[PDB]
Design a protein around this ligand. Structure first.
Ligand SMILES: *[C@@H]1O[C@H](CO)[C@@H](O)[C@H](O)[C@H]1NC(C)=O
Ligand SMILES: *[C@@H]1O[C@H](CO)[C@@H](O)[C@H](O)[C@H]1NC(C)=O
Ligand SMILES: *[C@@H]1O[C@H](CO)[C@@H](O)[C@H](O)[C@H]1NC(C)=O
Ligand SMILES: *[C@@H]1O[C@H](CO)[C@@H](O)[C@H](O)[C@H]1NC(C)=O
Ligand SMILES: *[C@@H]1O[C@H](CO)[C@@H](O)[C@H](O)[C@H]1NC(C)=O
Ligand SMILES: *[C@@H]1O[C@H](CO)[C@@H](O)[C@H](O)[C@H]1NC(C)=O
Ligand SMILES: *[C@@H]1O[C@H](CO)[C@@H](O)[C@H](O)[C@H]1NC(C)=O
Ligand SMILES: *[C@@H]1O[C@H](CO)[C@@H](O)[C@H](O)[C@H]1NC(C)=O
Ligand SMILES: *[C@@H]1O[C@H](CO)[C@@H](O)[C@H](O)[C@H]1NC(C)=O
Ligand SMILES: *[C@@H]1O[C@H](CO)[C@@H](O)[C@H](O)[C@H]1NC(C)=O
Lengths: 415, 451, 197, 49
């Protein structure tokens, strides 16, 4: 730690100890349902662009390898989550949206993006989890006469909120003159068809999108991955997996008064204190495993190679990964003695240590403030000195330090 | 705002005012000495037992070694401050069993052995008035394990890598140092700070203290009961003023509250995102792949490193201010308590007599005993007196007149005396001193020679 | 005994050593050597790595400057104290307790040192005490005699007046005593004769 | 003679002058004007700047 080969007399802080976790419990809700991914993933057609479909998936065990099995999609291109990390993460609710798109629309539908499609047809929220799966479906949407059953929306009075659907065949007027059943006198139909053709250009080929957007809430989680449940442990430093909330601590039985709608307890530093069990209605309190600093008490290596160890702030009945309990932790390697000397190596609240002859050893003691004195006071007694001494002492005071000068261009860059 | 009352002091070129009575005043000065020693671990704070975060934190160099060195230097300096202020005495003197010091009542500042921590009455009042935050210097992991009611703030400060180290000197040892200084002051005087302790009766010591401020020593011996009663009433007034109002100890309370809110801010800064998607490293490690989680962990590392550097810089500036206050408290212990100070407005307002230390949480309390003149009286004065063509000047005194007869008296008290050649000296003619008056000067040798 | 000046040397060496050592860190880039980033990558990616190195080196240099400023404030406080001690201990005599050494101050001699100054404080310390019996005043002919300067002492039979800091007894005389009041006021006044020259 | 109070004035002037002039720097971005970044770019890139 000191980057040397000889140390001096003193107390040095070397590292920090920690009680390692022993077991690994995974608490997990038991559900036998299988999520309808295969059932409503493979379809012969999708809905319109302006009028898509929403599918609610809940309360089931989820599998995420079916995207490779069913659709020949190019890339996941996902925000906020890894495709291979979905196997462990337990979510709140899965939302499935399936609708066809045009070629110049894969990059158009994104959080924090605008255009013409995102204003009316399909709008994604700016902060969300889950993602968009897209591929090529040019031959999957090529009738010999072309596709016009899909409709397109381009006119509205104002903007449209994310995750919303528009179903209308009204008339919009760009002026104060109403039309009411006539199209063309300064008013046109907001509903427009699609020019999907087998002989069309490459820039507007028909594509397809299945959305699998998830959400992260403090709601009671229903849909999870496939995992296994493990029975409870108590008063042990153990890693836990309570509904995907991982960590490490000691799961003491809680004393609290949790209301029936409250599951998670919260810390001031944003961590968790108490967690509701996913298999019963018992609240259990989390406490972190024991830790602290470690200090090595040594004299100089020119004197001896004996050391003492101070584990700071622990009632060391749980020391490991002469034993004396101290106010400042506990001291291993030093013997407590009922004497009083001056302080050589300062340890804690009144305790010092030193290298003493009485075979050599490292001793620990409470330090002495000085010799006890009791000057004889009386109401008619005085003490007057008859001689004197002249003494010369020494006082040392720093005055100045080193003057330095640094330039940025030589230090940061160097020509 | 008003600056104060308006006064038009009456100045004339032959008019003087001399006090006739005094009051004994006990004031109180409160000075901080030391502050809380803390140690912070980087790997628990920034990362918290995450291996990937530690591997990314290893690329940032040696920020954490110098943060650890700065906090260790502050923690050593606090113990140096307490040792410099209080441990100014070589031996632990103790009071004789007879509690008679010329009528002065020192029962409120001398300790009593009834309670385990042998502290006095006023020290107990000062210790109860400063409410502690109950920080991590007390071992509390046994209490952090036992979840009773709700989670404590101190446990939450402990759980994120912040540790509070106890001071080297316990409060009983500070109380023993204060008792030794009090016993040396009461029994010896200023002699215990210049070598060995030399006993002297308290009345003769107070006569020496009055001789220090330009008043003769017969003023004490002729008014011993009055001065004793004034000191006892002043000590009782300090006790009642402490037991009534609790706003006088605001400096040590500020010392406690600043450290409490600094640790609270450092704990609350862990909830911030700093542009990432979550403030929890486990969620980023479980949700994302390698590279994007590395980006989010690097953003969290930058934010938490910046907050830790801000905390350490504020701690260094606070420790410099605390060290300056501790140097001032050490100088006041050396000069007021171990001697008698001639510096104006140092060691209390008025002419200083003696001071008494009292230990307070994170500081010290001085009770300055001073001399304040009370009842003055207008007089007519002159610089010199002409007699037989010779100008007479007072040796140590001032010439005053009641209207008909001329007297010489000391400056700080009214004690008129007959003008004699013993208390005056001759210098020059009568034609050079502006304002000289005509009066006779007694010569004691002529009636001794005639009789 | 000279650990203060040695600490002043050691801190200034260690800060510069840490500032040199901080040039070896990557700070999230791919190399700590700038020419390798220049020679390996294109324009944009080398600009990204260079900006990471610039941010890290600027942060380390700012921390060095702030620590040096706080150290300079401490050094300036110590220099002001040394200047005051030079003006008061060396250029004059000080009546302040525990200033200019422990004891009754007589002299002081400055000595130069690396990055500092050394004072040799010469003081007066009383050595050999002796118990005595004392009184605040002397009652003689109904008049109380107080000492002018000094203190009344008794070796058991006779009464003397002596100075406070040295045992030099003298015969009690009206030249070294003054009269104030009668014997019925002072608590502890004793009966003794005062010589008339 | 009065250089110390003049320095007390000058330091407080030049610190605020540096604080005002620091708003002109780009700090690695493409513009020091916040409205230009808000008007020229999309949401994510303007968030980066
Ligand atoms: C889950 O477990 C609980 C108790 O362990 C049981 O009451 C419940 O019926 C189970 N649910 C299913 C779907 O099996
Ligand atoms: C979808 O279902 C149809 C009819 O059940 C089937 O012909 C087709 O092969 C299925 N698609 C895939 C990718 O399995
Ligand atoms: C904690 O330490 C104290 C100090 O010795 C001891 O009395 C107490 O039993 C300890 N608590 C335990 C071991 O639970
Ligand atoms: C002075 O002390 C003696 C013995 O110590 C005691 O008898 C006497 O009463 C004391 N004087 C006064 C005035 O109390
Ligand atoms: C002294 O004071 C009186 C009254 O104020 C004044 O008349 C006189 O001029 C003063 N003396 C001198 C020398 O000015
Ligand atoms: C004053 O002294 C007497 C004894 O001389 C003692 O009984 C009394 O308690 C003292 N006063 C106070 C307020 O303690
Ligand atoms: C002294 O004289 C002045 C002027 O006549 C007067 O104002 C003052 O009240 C008198 N008394 C005292 C005690 O100053
Ligand atoms: C004082 O007395 C001398 C001689 O006795 C005389 O010349 C002088 O005028 C007197 N001064 C006053 C102010 O009366
Ligand atoms: C004075 O008397 C006390 C008690 O009678 C004794 O302890 C001490 O040694 C004597 N001498 C001196 C020099 O104090
Ligand atoms: C001192 O002498 C006076 C008379 O001269 C006498 O009344 C008094 O009692 C004496 N005091 C002592 C203590 O002997």
């Amino acid at each position: 730690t000191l980057k040397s080969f000889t140390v001096e007399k003193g107390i040095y802080q070397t590292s920090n100890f920690r009680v390692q976790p022993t077991e690994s419990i995974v608490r997990f809700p038991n559900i036998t349902n299988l999520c309808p991914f295969h059932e409503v993933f493979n379809a012969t057609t999708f809905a319109s662009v302006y009028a898509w479909n929403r599918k609610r998936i809940s309360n089931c065990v989820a599998d995420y390898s079916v995207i490779y099995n069913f659709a020949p999609f190019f890339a996941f291109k996902c925000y906020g989550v890894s495709p291979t990390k979905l196997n462990d993460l337990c979510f709140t609710n899965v939302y499935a949206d399936s609708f066809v798109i045009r070629g110049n629309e894969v990059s158009q539908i994104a959080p924090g993006q605008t255009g013409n499609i995102a204003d009316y047809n399909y709008k994604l929220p700016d902060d969300f989890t889950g993602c968009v799966i897209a591929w090529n479906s040019n031959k999957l949407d090529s009738k010999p006469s072309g596709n016009y059953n899909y409709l397109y929306r381009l006119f509205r009075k104002s903007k449209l909120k994310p995750f919303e659907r528009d179903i209308s065949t009204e008339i919009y007027q760009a002026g104060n003159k109403p039309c009411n059943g006539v199209a063309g006198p300064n008013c046109y139909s907001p509903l427009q068809s699609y020019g999907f053709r087998p002989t069309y250009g490459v820039g507007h080929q028909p594509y397809r999108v299945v959305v699998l957007s998830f959400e992260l809430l403090h709601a009671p989680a229903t849909v999870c991955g496939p995992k296994k449940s493990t029975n409870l442990v108590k008063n042990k430093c153990v890693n836990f997996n309570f509904n995907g909330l991982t960590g490490t601590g000691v799961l003491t039985e809680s004393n609290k008064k949790f209301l029936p709608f409250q599951q998670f307890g919260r810390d001031i530093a944003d961590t968790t204190d108490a967690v509701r069990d996913p298999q019963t209605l018992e609240i259990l309190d989390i406490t972190p495993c024991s830790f602290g600093g470690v200090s090595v008490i040594t004299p100089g290596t020119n004197t001896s190679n004996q050391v003492a160890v101070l584990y700071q702030g622990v009632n060391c009945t749980e020391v490991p990964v002469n034993v004396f309990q101290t106010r400042a932790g506990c001291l291993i390697g030093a013997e407590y003695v009922n004497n009083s000397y001056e302080c050589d190596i300062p340890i804690g609240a009144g305790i010092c240590a030193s290298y003493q002859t009485q075979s050599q050893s490292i001793i620990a003691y409470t330090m002495s403030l000085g010799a006890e004195n009791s000057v004889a006071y009386s109401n008619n007694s005085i003490a007057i000195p008859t001689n004197f001494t002249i003494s010369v002492t020494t006082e040392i005071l720093p005055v100045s330090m080193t003057k330095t000068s640094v330039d940025c261009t030589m230090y940061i860059c160097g020509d | 705002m008003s600056l104060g009352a308006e006064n038009s002091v009456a100045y004339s070129n032959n008019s003087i005012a001399i006090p006739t009575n005094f009051t004994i005043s006990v004031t109180t000065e409160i000075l901080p000495v030391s502050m809380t020693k803390t140690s912070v671990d980087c790997t628990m704070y920034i990362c918290g037992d995450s291996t990937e975060c530690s591997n990314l934190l290893l690329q940032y160099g040696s920020f954490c070694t110098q943060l650890k060195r700065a906090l260790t230097g502050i923690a050593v300096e606090q113990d140096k401050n307490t040792q410099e202020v209080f441990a100014q005495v070589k031996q632990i003197y103790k009071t004789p069993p007879i509690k008679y010091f010329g009528g002065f009542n020192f029962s409120q500042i001398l300790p009593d052995p009834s309670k385990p921590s042998k502290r006095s009455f006023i020290e107990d009042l000062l210790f109860n008035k400063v409410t502690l935050a109950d920080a991590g210097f007390i071992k509390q992991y046994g209490d952090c394990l036992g979840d009773i009611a709700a989670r404590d703030l101190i446990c939450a400060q402990k759980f994120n890598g912040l540790t509070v180290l106890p001071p080297l000197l316990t409060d009983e040892m500070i109380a023993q140092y204060t008792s030794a200084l009090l016993a040396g002051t009461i029994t010896s005087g200023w002699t215990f700070g210049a070598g060995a302790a030399l006993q002297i009766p308290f009345a003769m010591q107070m006569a020496y203290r009055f001789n220090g401020i330009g008043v003769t020593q017969n003023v004490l011996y002729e008014n011993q009961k009055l001065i004793a009663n004034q000191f006892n009433s002043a000590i009782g007034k300090i006790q009642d003023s402490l037991s009534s109002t609790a706003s006088a100890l605001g400096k040590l309370q500020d010392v406690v509250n600043h450290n409490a809110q600094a640790l609270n801010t450092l704990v609350k800064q862990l909830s911030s995102k700093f542009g990432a998607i979550s403030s929890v490293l486990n969620d980023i490690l479980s949700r994302l792949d390698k590279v994007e989680a590395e980006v989010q962990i690097d953003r969290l590392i930058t934010g938490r490193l910046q907050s830790l550097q801000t905390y350490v810089t504020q701690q260094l500036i606070r420790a410099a201010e605390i060290r300056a206050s501790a140097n001032l408290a050490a100088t006041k212990m050396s000069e007021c308590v171990l001697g008698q100070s001639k510096r104006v407005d140092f060691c209390g307002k008025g002419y200083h007599l003696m001071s008494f230390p009292q230990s307070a949480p994170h500081g010290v309390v001085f009770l300055h005993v001073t001399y304040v003149p009370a009842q003055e009286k207008n007089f007519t004065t002159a610089p010199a007196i002409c007699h037989d063509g010779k100008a007479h000047f007072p040796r140590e005194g001032v010439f005053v007149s009641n209207g008909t007869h001329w007297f010489v008296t000391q400056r700080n008290f009214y004690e008129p005396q007959i003008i004699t050649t013993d208390n005056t000296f001759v210098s020059g003619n009568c034609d050079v001193v502006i304002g000289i008056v005509n009066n006779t000067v007694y010569d004691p040798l002529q009636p001794e020679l005639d009789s």
